[PDB]
Amino acid sequence: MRILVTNDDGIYSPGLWALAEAASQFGEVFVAAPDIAHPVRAYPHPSPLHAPHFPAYRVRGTPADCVALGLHLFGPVDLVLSGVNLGSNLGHEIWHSGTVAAAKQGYLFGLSAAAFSVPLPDFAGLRPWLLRTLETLLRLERPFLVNVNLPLRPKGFLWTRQSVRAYEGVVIPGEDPMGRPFYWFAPRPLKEAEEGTDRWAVAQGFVSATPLRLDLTDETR
Amino acid sequence: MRILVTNDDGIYSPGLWALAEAASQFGEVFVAAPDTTIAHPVRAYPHPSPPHFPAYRVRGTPADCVALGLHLFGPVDLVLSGVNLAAAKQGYLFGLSAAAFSVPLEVPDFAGLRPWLLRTLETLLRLERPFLVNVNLPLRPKGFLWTRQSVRAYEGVVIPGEDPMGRPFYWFAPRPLKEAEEGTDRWAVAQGFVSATPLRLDLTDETRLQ
Amino acid sequence: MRILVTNDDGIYSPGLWALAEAASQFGEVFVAAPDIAHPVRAYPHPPHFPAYRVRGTPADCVALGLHLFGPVDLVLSGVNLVAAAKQGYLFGLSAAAFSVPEVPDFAGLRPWLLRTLETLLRLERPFLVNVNLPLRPKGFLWTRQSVRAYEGVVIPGEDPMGRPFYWFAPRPLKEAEEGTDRWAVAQGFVSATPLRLDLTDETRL
Amino acid sequence: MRILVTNDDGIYSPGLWALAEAASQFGEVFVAAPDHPVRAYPHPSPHFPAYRVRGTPADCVALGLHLFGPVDLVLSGVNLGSNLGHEIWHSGTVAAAKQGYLFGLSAAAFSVPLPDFAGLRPWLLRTLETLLRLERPFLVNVNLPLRPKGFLWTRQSVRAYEGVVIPGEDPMGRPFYWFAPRPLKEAEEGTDRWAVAQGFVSATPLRLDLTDETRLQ
């Protein structure tokens, strides 16, 4: 099978290549990553030095643009991967993240897809977990759409649901050196993450894998 | 009931005041709007409302205004963002009910839209609390519709092209409007209908987890 | 004459309309405000002035405005609360930027915009001038840029939750060097700084 | 000799480590790259202590000087992009170099209009040594062609531009204008662009501001 790999950190991020090398084990892989009708420019790009080779393009555009372009430039691909993104994509942030958006883009086109994030990393120690998460996802009924969060050093794997905690708008008064007054604003979650949630799995050293839907519509309502 | 009103375009947008005014028919409205995850400094200063509304010019994002507003104008039962040419999501994330109002775009005629703001506000207020709704209004509506978020439209198209300098590039365009799906926000607006989409801040697909 | 007027805050900034109206007293004014090789959308928008809302940068407004409003003799950006004025200057036109570093009272400032414009329009063309006005000006001074106003110190500090950070804060205006834009505005004077788009240190060559 | 290195494209940029690796062949190198209050987080890099900063290039320099304390030279780059002519007065890299000079040190910005930093290492060292022979403090803007074949001193290219605006429509019927600033005259001899256009490294000594002093006499 043919896999397109992208990210939202860019063509020079190590996470990107960690994900690509991990993917190369299961299929031929191609890379397209950033460097209303809108224009999009892509340019051929050399893969990292001593790493395995990978046809690739640096794209002046969004992660989603990278997916549409990648599918157009790299012919027929069967799977879209996004990551490994540097930072975390847990709970509420998964619905306003460019990392989740590219995977969604892939799924909108009819392909299985998945996002990889790691709340901050050593990709040498994660390689095997990337490999093992990848072979798990590949047994799912296709097509699939999954958001994967890996802890720095995972000790397991759990299917999860997004943590939907409520927050408190903590707002404390302050002033900077020049005397000027201002207000500190720091949203704070109201409760510690619940068991079964991505955040709970991650905080416990478990790779978190969350099946996603395409939108936020409250159809029950 | 108390209402905090804010927007994306800032304190000088006529859209903000149109909404503030429409909301006043429904309760006491306080205003906080921009002047243009970790703790971050945010400045706010009292601002003269152009109906007189207590208001703050806020040097921060629409989300920042919600947090400062509640701090500066106590509690409110409803957070409204708009009319626009985070906020509501922020309000809802703090446990309050919220709606965002947007006029997808010539210039809109607010005098003309006021009855629509009222009608929409009367309908939303019939919802179970707390609710989060995304409202999109055509320039000249002819109706109202509960909708879901348009998704098919983003299964776009990639067309090659060249800029006047002969340099090549590809266009990534969404599906054409004529192709929008019926109960979606996109179909409704394109068709002249005010669109009201109830939102759930959970991107989880439970049917794949049971 | 013909004046293209733009700003940095966008089409709903009062500062923009205060500037447009004042410059309307010295020539005809066309507005293009922001609400290589790239697309740019612009739509007609509604003392009346022809105008366009431009889904691009201040730099784009200048190029588009010049294409839309036939020739123009001067580009003005502001009053603000690649820079447009500079863009205007890169195209061969004279240009000036107006900025006011509390909400500004544009009634009290109107006579000052006028008085500044008056002096600007008497300069040998082409020129590029950065204009900074205080809230209640009491005069006008030709000045040089205060580069030392960027040499701010970093002050350690912690946020309410014990999370560390450093304040990068400018140098207090009390340290304003005499003869510079910053000193002028501090002493209540409108500051007008003539610039040249050449960062070359000739003495070092 | 101590040295603070930073850039405009961030801490994963290869241009950055080329410049730094090169600089360590001259002194103890410290790195501060970007990705009001400023925040920095230690980052892994030979090994150079390093920080990733949530702020502007100037912030990194100010922040970098406060951490790595007493430094003698600030370098910014190597940036994946030209920094020629009008580009230098609206560039983060030059901005950073400028911040170091403001603090009193010698500074320089390195850019490469596009890159094999392996076939460029000998030049970065050579250029760096040339700079070091200059009188302290200095502030220079350096542009290296992808494939150099000589060095030479330059002044910033200063030319008029035309705003080419051509109407067009997107494949959906929506109207728009193409905008492309095109230079009228060609780059003049002795300028940074003139040099770099012919495989020569460009070095342009800079001043702190754009005030037109001649217009003030």
Swiss-Prot record, chain B:
Binding-site positions, a divalent metal cation: 8-9, 84
UniProt keyword annotation of Nucleotide-binding present: yes
Molecular function terms from GO: 3'-nucleotidase activity; 5'-nucleotidase activity; exopolyphosphatase activity; metal ion binding; nucleotide binding
Reactions it catalyzes: a ribonucleoside 5'-phosphate + H2O = a ribonucleoside + phosphate
Protein location: Cytoplasm
Swiss-Prot/TrEMBL cofactor(s): a divalent metal cation
Signal sequence annotation: none
NCBIfam families tied to this protein: surE
Function: Nucleotidase that shows phosphatase activity on nucleoside 5'-monophosphates.
Designated name of the protein: 5'-nucleotidase SurE
Organism expressing this protein natively: Thermus thermophilus (strain ATCC 27634 / DSM 579 / HB8)
Gene: surE
UniProtKB/Swiss-Prot annotation, chain D:
Catalysed transformations (reactions): a ribonucleoside 5'-phosphate + H2O = a ribonucleoside + phosphate
Cofactor descriptive note: Binds 1 divalent metal cation per subunit.
Known cofactor(s): a divalent metal cation
Entry EC number(s): 3.1.3.5
Chain segments annotated as transmembrane: none
Pfam families on file: SurE
GO MF terms, alphabetically ordered: 3'-nucleotidase activity; 5'-nucleotidase activity; exopolyphosphatase activity; metal ion binding; nucleotide binding
Entries under Gene3D superfamilies matching the protein: Survival protein SurE-like phosphatase/nucleotidase
Protein's UniProt keywords contain Nucleotide-binding: yes
Keyword set, alphabetical order: Cytoplasm, Hydrolase, Metal-binding, Nucleotide-binding, Plasmid
Positions contributing to a divalent metal cation binding: 8-9, 79
GO cellular component, one term: cytoplasm
Compartment(s) of residence: Cytoplasm
Family: Belongs to the SurE nucleotidase family.
Functional note: Nucleotidase that shows phosphatase activity on nucleoside 5'-monophosphates.
NCBIfam families referenced in this protein's UniProt entry, alphabetically: surE
Name the UniProt record assigns to this protein: 5'-nucleotidase SurE
Species: Thermus thermophilus (strain ATCC 27634 / DSM 579 / HB8)
